Structure 1
């Protein structure tokens, strides 16, 4: 099965993985770990016993100062993979932000637009994405492409429903239910909302569809 990420960043030597967890419930533990078959814990934070960094990450990673940004000092080729920033609280249980680290050459930020939407601040921006050539569509996702990172805003799996909670610091009105998944709304739009908004559609054989919409706020 596919690994769902919330943020995608390129590989770097002084690479930092941002994780700003909300102040909610009875805080139990905050931890970093590399997603894989083998147990690979990086750092574990206790609200009473402080921070503990496991080997062989003890000489590669560090922290500064609700923000758990994981900084790296000379990262190796092997550090390319999926990272998790998990927050354990009562009575919620688990909060997880998955960060994907990709190769410097494989990461693309300079992508061309298809439509340019101009909107006044405070209004609701409605973004639509309809299948053009391929049908039945299995998955639909919305992304905000920045020059140094890509953030997953929405994700809907229509063939077999999956768990997706956006860790984006902005409210996005969306519904994965049948007859509602094509339209996503950004309510009370700010000047900071300006950027590239890519839509990705996945089919059965593997044929994909991309629709990039550029937003500009006055």
Structure 2
């Protein structure tokens, strides 16, 4: 129901970068208040821009090297009412839409609730293998890989072997994931890792009983 969770802050940014090579035709930023949706912004490559009147002077598009591929939404002065789920919709007709769902939550640093269980050192330029030490059998229903930062948590992979539809990560940096039926090691691979790939990587299991387990790796790439 969400691809990225970011911490509520006065100048928070909802990252959204189109990862595909298709020619863009439109972006839309929406917030799902309830069942109804509020159209925050609509932008077209002809520089036509719709902005919802209540968001007139509340949001902007910093978007380093502005090229309409990066449409991350930044707040000037956010408040508790800005908590909720946002949708960032890229249209690249005829190729079809690419949607990233962002949930804003009231919280402290996400790293607080993710103390590292393992420390992983690796040299730059190598394919780093992250190993989840959590069991995958019943009652566990799905296993999720996330990158945990103080301000945001990005879902890198999600595997539910019973689900017929697969989960596609909206994370910009490429990773190698595998949702296989075998009883092998639950692995996430970071290809050609750099110093920017350092940080907390958390594998998370969700069970049919509702119980939540987590295993956190502190990856350090000098």
Alignment partner of 2:178 out of 175, 179, 182? 175
CA offsets per residue over residues 104-162 of structure 1, 9 Å max, x none? 34x53223111111111222222222444972321110111112221111111223244
Does residue 6 of structure 2 align to residue 6 of structure 1? Answer: no
Q: Unpaired runs of 5+ in structure 2?
A: none
Aligned to 1:78, the other structure's residue is in SS state helix
> Contact conserved, 2:147 with 2:201, CA < 8 A, in 1?
yes
After superposition, where does 1:1-218 map in structure 2 within 5 Å? 3=1, 5-22=2-19, 24-35=21-32, 36-48=34-46, 50-64=48-62, 65=66, 66-105=69-108, 108-110=110-112, 111-132=114-135, 135-179=138-182, 182-218=186-222
CA–CA separation in structure 2 for the residues paired with 1:133 and 1:49: 49
Runs of 4+ residues deviating >3 angstroms: 130-134
Which whole-Å CA distance do the structure 2 matches of 1:96 and 1:147 have between them?
24
Worse overlay, 205-214 or 11-20: 11-20
Distance change (3 Å), C-alpha of 1:109 and 1:162: farther
Per-residue displacement from partner, 1:154-200 (whole Å, max 9, x unpaired)?
11122324442222232211121312682221122212111111010
Helix, strand or coil at the partner of 1:142: strand
Three-state SS of the structure 1 residue aligned to 2:53 is coil
Distance 2:142 2:185 in 1: 10
Counterpart secondary structure, 2:196: helix
* Aligned residue pair count: 214
CA shift at 1:91, angstroms? 3.1
Deviation at 1:49, TM superposition (A): 5.0
Q: TM-score, normalised by structure 1?
A: 0.88
RMSD: 2.2
CA contact (8 A) 1:24 1:89 kept: no
